[PDB]
C-alpha cells in the first residue's frame, strides 16, 4: 500500500546477482504444504530473473570484479552510471569497453582504463 523512500541502495552489482541466486534457492524452500497455497510467485520472479541473468555475461565470477570496476573508475571522476553500465554488462573482452561499449574511454583519458581492460581479460569471459 504505502512506501516512504523509493531509492535506498548503492551496492555491489555482481553481489546483488549472486544474492538474487540465493533468493531463488531460498524461495523454493517454502514448498511445504502449509505455506504452499498462499504464496508461490516469488519462485516465478526468482527463476525469470535468474534466466535473464544467465543471458547476461555477468555470471561465472565473483563480486570482486565490482570493487575492481568501482576502484578503477570512481578514482578517475567517472560517475556511478558509467561503472553501473559496465557492471550490468560485465564486458566479455577488453576492447569491448572501448569500442563495443561506449562512455568508458575519456574520463580515464584512455590511460588507466587499460588496467581495467587487463582485469576484464583476466577474469571476465
Amino acid at each position: 500500500m504505502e512506501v516512504k523512500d523509493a531509492n535506498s541502495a548503492l551496492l555491489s552489482n555482481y553481489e546483488v546477482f549472486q544474492l538474487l541466486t540465493d533468493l531463488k534457492e531460498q524461495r523454493k524452500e517454502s514448498g511445504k504444504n502449509k505455506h504452499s497455497s498462499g504464496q508461490q510467485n516469488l519462485n516465478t520472479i526468482t527463476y525469470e530473473t535468474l534466466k535473464y541473468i544467465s543471458k547476461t555475461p555477468c555470471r561465472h565470477q565473483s563480486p570482486e570484479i565490482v570493487r575492481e570496476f568501482l576502484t578503477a573508475l570512481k578514482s578517475h571522476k567517472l560517475t556511478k552510471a558509467e561503472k553501473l553500465q559496465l557492471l550490468n554488462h560485465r564486458p566479455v573482452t577488453a576492447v569491448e569497453i572501448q569500442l563495443m561499449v561506449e562512455e568508458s574511454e575519456e574520463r580515464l583519458t584512455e590511460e588507466q582504463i587499460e588496467a581495467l581492460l587487463h582485469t576484464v581479460t583476466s577474469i571476465l569471459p
Partner: protein
C-alpha cells in the same frame, strides 16, 4: 545497485505462530502481499535483504489478527540510466514489437526504433531487418527473438496495460541487428 525501497504496509500475522520463530515468518508475511501485477509503484513480487526495525505489533482492540507495520527495504528494478543488457524480441504486432530484458515482461518498441529502413512486414507479421548497409538490400529476416543489446529508459504501473520501451538506434554503434 538494485534499488532498496522503504515500505510501510499492514502486516497481518496470524495467531498460528505468536510464540514461534519470528524473523523469517515476518519476511514471509512481507512477501505475502507484494505481488507482481498491482501493489504500488514501484513494486512487483520482490523481497528484502536487511532489517531496519520492527514497530508496534498490536493484536486488535480485542479481535484475532495483528497490527504490525513495516520498516524494511524492497529490492525493486527501477528503470535506471539505460543500463546495457541483452534484449530478446518478445513478440510482434503492427503497432510495435515486444521485447524482453529482465525487469518487466512487455516492452513496446515503435517501428522507427527498429533499424531505420527495417519496417514491420504485416503481410507476415515479421519485423524483417532491412539491413541497408554496404549499399545492399540485405533483408536480415529475423522474426520474434531478434538479437538486440537493449537498454531501457522507463517503467510503468498504472495504465490498463507493465509496459516498457528500450531506446535503440545507438549513434556510436548503429547496427540495431546487434545493438
Amino acid at each position: 545497485m538494485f534499488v532498496l525501497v522503504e515500505m510501510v504496509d499492514t502486516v497481518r500475522i496470524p495467531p498460528w505462530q505468536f510464540e514461534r520463530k519470528l524473523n523469517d515468518s515476518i519476511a514471509e508475511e512481507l512477501n505475502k502481499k507484494l505481488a507482481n501485477k498491482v501493489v504500488y509503484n514501484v513494486g512487483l513480487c520482490i523481497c528484502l535483504f536487511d532489517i531496519t526495525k520492527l514497530e508496534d505489533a498490536y493484536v486488535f482492540p480485542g479481535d484475532g489478527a495483528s497490527h504490525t507495520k513495516v520498516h524494511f527495504r524492497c529490492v525493486v528494478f527501477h528503470p535506471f540510466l539505460d543500463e546495457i543488457l541483452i534484449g530478446k524480441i518478445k513478440g510482434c504486432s503492427p503497432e510495435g514489437v515486444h521485447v524482453s530484458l529482465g525487469f518487466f515482461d512487455d516492452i513496446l518498441i515503435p517501428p522507427e526504433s527498429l533499424q531505420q529502413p527495417a519496417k514491420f512486414d504485416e503481410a507476415e507479421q515479421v519485423w524483417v531487418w532491412e539491413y541497408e548497409t554496404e549499399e545492399g538490400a540485405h533483408d536480415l529476416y529475423m522474426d520474434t527473438g531478434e538479437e538486440i543489446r537493449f537498454r531501457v529508459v522507463d517503467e510503468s504501473f498504472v495504465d490498463t496495460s507493465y509496459t516498457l520501451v528500450g531506446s535503440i538506434s545507438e549513434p556510436g554503434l548503429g547496427l540495431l541487428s546487434w545493438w
